[PDB]
Structures are given as structure tokens and as C-alpha cells.
Symmetry: D2
Subunit: 251 residues, 4 copies
Amino acid sequence: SHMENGHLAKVDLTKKIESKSKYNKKLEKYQRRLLALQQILKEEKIAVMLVMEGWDAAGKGGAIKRVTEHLDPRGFQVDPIGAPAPHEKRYHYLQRFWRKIPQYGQITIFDRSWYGRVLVERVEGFATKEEWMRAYDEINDFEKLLTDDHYIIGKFFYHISKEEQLKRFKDREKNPLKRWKITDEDWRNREKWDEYVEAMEDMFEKTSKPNAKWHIIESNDKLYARVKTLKIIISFIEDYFLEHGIELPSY
Amino acid sequence: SHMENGHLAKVDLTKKIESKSKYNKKLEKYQRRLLALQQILKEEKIAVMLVMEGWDAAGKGGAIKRVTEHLDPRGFQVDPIGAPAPHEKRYHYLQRFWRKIPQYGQITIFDRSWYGRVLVERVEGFATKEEWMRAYDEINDFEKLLTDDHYIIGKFFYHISKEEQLKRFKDREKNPLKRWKITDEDWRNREKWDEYVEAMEDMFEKTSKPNAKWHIIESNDKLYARVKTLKIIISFIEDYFLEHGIELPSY
Amino acid sequence: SHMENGHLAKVDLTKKIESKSKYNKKLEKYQRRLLALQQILKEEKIAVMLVMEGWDAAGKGGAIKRVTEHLDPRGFQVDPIGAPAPHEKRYHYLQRFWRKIPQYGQITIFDRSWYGRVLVERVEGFATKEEWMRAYDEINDFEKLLTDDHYIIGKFFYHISKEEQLKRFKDREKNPLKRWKITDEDWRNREKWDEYVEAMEDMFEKTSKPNAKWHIIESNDKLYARVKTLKIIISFIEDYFLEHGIELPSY
Amino acid sequence: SHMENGHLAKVDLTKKIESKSKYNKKLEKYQRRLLALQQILKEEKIAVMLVMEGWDAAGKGGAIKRVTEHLDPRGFQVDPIGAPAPHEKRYHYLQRFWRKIPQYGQITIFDRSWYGRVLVERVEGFATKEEWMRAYDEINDFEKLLTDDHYIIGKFFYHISKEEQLKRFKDREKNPLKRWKITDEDWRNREKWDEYVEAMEDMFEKTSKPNAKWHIIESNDKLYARVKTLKIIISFIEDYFLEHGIELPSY
């Protein structure tokens, strides 16, 4: 099929970090670096937008936590994106995202995003064929608007196996503290798994751009995922500084 | 030159309505019609955006007043657009407009607009060459986003002669009630008149689209201007209703 | 009764301005003065809040129009207050007013106000006995907060006879342009007229304060009403300037 | 002195939890309970406001983290309060807090608060004598407004010794990840320590009310502090449910 040579099928899900302590050392290393870059970001009038998509339970929440753990909370916002509330449905679909875009020197992090227009909204049919079919180009224009200006955009997709999802779904059910986090909605979405793959493959084809790359994170192991998120970010910020003459902190 | 066969040079500035009373009758006729359409707008989940550009003193303020005089104030907002305030300069240039776009069933009216990016911002150099050169396509995308959805957009440009501007500038100075309304800024802008023409011609070429037409209103006579504004609006709303199956009120 | 020696019963409804032209001269005189004070307001970090209450059709809308006709629209906002929308009902009742209070140097004008908590909300029972009974002191605290700071507050009540209301209700029905403006709600409220009087008398007793006076405007004649509104405003602004050392423009 | 029999001098700073594991068990116990109450909160149209004040480094940040760790992020906001930004200084001092108050069913958490008007603003003289002297009663009115409605308010003050502060200040300096978190401002404020005590004692006297109690948390040991925060919250929520007939989850 096309799903046999698709992006998600080609992903090596064996990736991992075996030692918990060598994880902690790498995290703290990358956390230090990211904080140093946050100071240069604040001064230099550059805004960062991070988009995080993926399967339910795939560890977007976990990754964001590690990205922001030791950042200054005054310099970042985390925006968790669900279904449009009734007040948002009265405006064009992008209006609610435009209100959340960071000011210069600031980071906004999207737990889900506008990409819902071509995922959940497509598969559940909340958006018509015409709406989701034109939306890829709308989303690209939106990204380019900001990147042609002084925004940096990074997009991450956390990929896990269907079997790993089930293991995590079961653990969220057994733990009382995590029992919110798993709902009938979560199970419904796993049932549509293969429709989602089709939709996610189209998204990687249509909306992976030089100014706004999709990064597919192998996420069966949370440790690898979290550390690779930090690594990719640090890298695309440094690349941006080097390109535009800004001076890096200890590189 | 190109300004000899430009849009603004071809405009017939002699247009007028001689009788004040035949003006009042036409206004009230079109005002009644527009109110009737406002009820259909509210119910039907359609949003209208009006953009008004033009020379200082050209009568945008006057036109808006006649458009909204007998409308329900709960169903429209008038947004007067000046230079970005310090808080707006911290975000991408379109963010402040996205916050002002109408909800469905509502009208927003822009006294100036995003088009400032390719007019004042160009001539005074607040926007670089790259910024204003790419902005025409950005503005077009923005308009099409909304028109591909459920927004109707109408753009009006109020054109007067340089001599008529001077007459109005002088009257605003003599009348104490109108003395705000004329500033050093106004005089500065008249000095750059021919740069503005060049910039306005480019705008009419680049951003006049089937879904979002520029309408050049002959405005040496305020009466004609005001009545032609109402006429054009009524028309493009009715056209939208006819196209999308909605039923008109007494047409 | 108490309504025989009430505030509204004592009001002389014969007040009028006989000559339309002597009205126009007085209006323009007071409009010039108010604009001059608006410049001193902007510079001096003082905010003005105007509250307008009254019967339906009593001319609040008309008065506001004359107050703002020749003011700079960048220095004032007019906020028309209806029943709380669903999104506002999720917060405490004053939260929606706190969002509308003017910044320093600016004027906000309330077409209705928080006073709805002790009028419509009382008579229609949208607010319990406890809620509206404690609300007078809450509203007083709110006013004093702002007046103890750098806000000036003026409150106006437009009083007309029951017979004058009916005449205006009939005219709004016959004129197509004014037919919005009269609804079943308007008729329902006239039926509760005497409950409203009781509620309005309590409000004048409980919430008329030195820092925030109620001004009962005789409004059977729109002309007198409009001109007396401007006169009272000009006066309480000038008084504020004199009290706090600010220098007036041509007094 | 008065500071010898003051609230903060009477506090027993020896309080602690010796075992890290018996801490983890208690935290998870109270975290489970709080989540269960969060579901009843959402359904029942009750809003919670938590205020957290205290010395720099006293563990407000730590406490909030434990309070919210296993809560649904869609049902709470954490608002970190610094000095007013230029845009906030254009409005009355409480306006920025009114924008942050939770909707019904939601929790807002203030890392600092309006109480800055009678602490930092007093000692550094950003607020005049008249301003901070009247502010205690203003703050009380504000709290009572919300408590007379359907808001629950809990206020926490995290108290540590001057010597413990120094130890933490030194640790924040040595750790690169925590080096933001300690600034010249932090050192300046420790120099004014005794002025702060005077100001905090006045605040506990003037603004500790039955509907809005101050809870002085012994915080030399972070573990005790965090667990006592959860305990107090769970308790004042349960008390509110019992008082108003709502049924508790497993009590």
C-alpha cells in the first residue's frame, strides 16, 4: 500500500535510551543550553512557536514538560488545544490561533494545533471535504507569514505503535491520578487509527516545509522522545541565530 | 506616464447629486434596504467586512456614518485604524486585524486597514522593501481565507482631487469642532501625494480580486459618495444571498 | 404614597427649549467646550465614566450621540449594555464591567450599566433578593474605588412621562428605520412601569453619592435633555480640574 | 516590640516531614482527593481562587507545582504576578486582577496577587501612603464580592527564616538551571526584610477574614509546606460543599 512506504511505517520505533541516569545527564545538558538561548531570544526580538501533534498517550504532554521544566515561565506560554468552544465557532477557524501567537522574544507551545483541521476535523467530518482539502495551503501560508517575519516554527509528531498505545491506555486507567487523560473519546480515536494514518501521511507530504519542518519523533520510549525534542529545538534555534548574525552563548 | 492611464486619473470626479432632498430620499431608501439585509445577515451566519481607504478628508468618516446611521449597533463594530501602538508592534502585523474580524452574523467596518502596510508603511518606510513587496500576496491570502469561508468583503477607496482636499483641509482648520481631524501629519501626507498615487495604483492592480473587489468612489461630492457606498454594499450582499440560496427581503 | 414624594414624581417634566436654532447654538457652544476639555483629559491622566439609565425611548441614545458627535473617537468608547451573554454569565456580574472601564485619559460611556443589577435584574427576578439587596453597596464600593483613584464618574437618568413613552413607542413602530429599537421586551417593560419606579427610587436613595451623583434629566423634550447633559458634564469635569490644580482652557 | 508577638515570630519553623517516602505517600493521597473534588467543582458552578504570598525562595512555586501536578490543566490557570507592565498602569490597579478571576467551575492560582499593593508597593513607595492605607479595605471588599457570590478564596503565606532564605539564595546561584530565579531584585528585597515584616503583620491583621482566611505555612521544609497546602485546600473545599448541600466523593 502507500501506508507500507509511508513516513510512519518507515520510522524505527526501537530507538531508546537504556540508562535512566544517562538520560538525566543529557536532559540537564540540553535544558541548560535551551535556557541560555531563551535569554538571547528575549533580547533579540525573535518568537518561537512549537507545535506538538501525535497519537493520544504518545508523550506530547511529557515532552512539553521537559522542554519547559527549567525555562522562565514569563517567557513562554503553553496552549492546550481541544475542540473549538462555542464562542470560537463564531469566527473563522484560524482566529483562535492568531490570538495565541507569541509576541517577539516569547515562546508559545501548542499541545495540539491548527493541524486538527486536517486530522480530527477531517476524520470525524467536522470539516467538509472542501474545507480540509484547501486547509493544507492555508496552514502553509499561515506558517510562512510568521517565518517570513521574525517567527521560528518547529513542529513535532510523536509516533508510537498501536500496541504501545494500548499499554499506556491501560496504565492511565489503573492509576487514579491519570484516570482523567483517558476517555471514551480516546478509545473512539484509536478505533479510527488507520484513517488517522492516511490523514497524517497527507499532512507530512503537504505541510513539511523548509521554514517549518515536521519532525517525526520515535516515542515508544518517553526518554528518547524527550531528549530528541530538546536536541532538535536547540539545533533549529542555533541555526536561526547563525543565519541572522546573532551570537550564540557557549557553542 | 503610468499615472496618466492609472485608475485614479481615469476617475470622473464630476459625479454629483445636485439636489439635497433627492439625496435624502435615496439615502433613506438604501438605509431601509440595508437594515432589512442586516436581519438576514444576523440569522444566516454570514459576516461582512468593509474596508475604507482614501485620501485624508476624502469622506470615509462621512460614508461610514451614513452606512451605520440606522443600523443596529449590536450587529456592527467600527474599528478606526491608526499607526500600530507599542503593544501591537510586539506581534506580526496582521495579528491586530485578526482580533478585529467580525463574528458570523456581524459587520466590522475598518476606517483604515491592513492596506496601510502597502501605503503609509511603504511611503514613510516603516516597512522595508521586502515587507511591502510580499505584503500584497499576504493581504490577498488573508482576504481569500475569509471569503472561502463565510465572510463577505467589500473595499472602498474615496478619491478626491488635490484641490478639493485643500478646500476641506482649510474648512477643518476654520471650524473649531473639526480642528482635531487636521494635523501636521495630514499636511505631511499631502506633500507625498504623488508617492501615494504610485502606491495606490500598485494596490488596485495587485489586490483587486473577484471575491474582494476594490471600488473607487468618486468623492469630490460627499453626497454622491455616501449614496454610492450604500448602493454597492446592498448589491454585493444581495449577490451573495442569490448565489448561496438565501432569500432576500423585498427585491 | 412614597411614590408621590419620590424623586421622579417631583421632577418638572415641562422643561424645554422652544427654539430649534437656540438649541443648535447652545449645543455647539457646549460641544466646543467639551472638546477643549477632552485635550486636557488626554494629557492629564484622568479617566471619565458616564452612566446613562432611563426608560426605554427616553433619549439616552440621543444624548450620547450629542455628547460624542464632535469628540475624537480615539479618546472615547461607547459600550451598549444588554442582558449578559452566555460567556459573561460564567463570571461574577461585575467582571464584564471591569473589562470596559476606561484607561487614563479616556472616556467610556455606558448606555446601560451595572445598575441593571438593581433594576431589570430585580424586577424580572434574574437576581435573588439577597443579590440585589447587597448590590447597592457593591456598586457604591465599585464607584468609590475608581473615584478614590483618578476616575471621574457621572450618572444620568433620563425621565419621561408614561404618555410620552407611548408617543415615542408609536413613532418607532411607524418609522421603518426605527422599527428595530422597539420590541416585545420594550412593551413588557412598560407594563412593569410602577415596579421600575420603586426600584429606581431605591437606587437614587442608596447610590447617589458626592463622588458619583445621580443627575435626573427632564427628558420629555429631547432638546433640553441633550443640552443639559453636556452642561452637567462640562461642569463636573471643570470642578475636578479646579479641585486638583489642573488649568482650564478658556473659563 | 510588636514584631516579637507578631504572627510570623510566633510561627514554629521546626515543622517538617522527616521521611521522603512518607511525604510521597501523603502527597499522592491528597492529590487523589483534590482531583476528585475538581470534578465536583467543574459540575457545580463554583470557582476557586488561591493566593500565594511569601518571601522569595519560600517555596510558593514548589507548592503550586504540587497542587496542580495531577490536576486537569483545562480546569485551572496559574497566573504569575509581577510588577505592572506599562499597559496595565493605564488602568486602576485591580483591573488586571479582574481579568484573571476564574470562571465558575475553574481554579485560578495567583503566584503573587493584589496583596502587592500593601507589600512591595508600600515598602518601595510605588503606592502613596493614602493608596496603601485604603487598600486593605478595597482588597477586603474585592474578596467579599466574590465570596458573597460563588467563589471560594484561599490565601497562603509561605514563611521561612532569614537564614533559610540565604541558603536557598546560594543554591539558586550555584545551580545553572535555577540561576534565573535569583536577581539583584531578590537581594534588594532581603535587605528590606524588616519593613516587609511590618507590612505583612499589618496585612494579616487587616485582611484575614472568615470568608478569606490567611494561612501561614511553615516552609523551612518544602515537604511539610507542600503537603499542608493540599490539606488546607481539600479542607476548605469540603467545608464549602458541606455548607451548601453538595455531596462529597469519598469522605
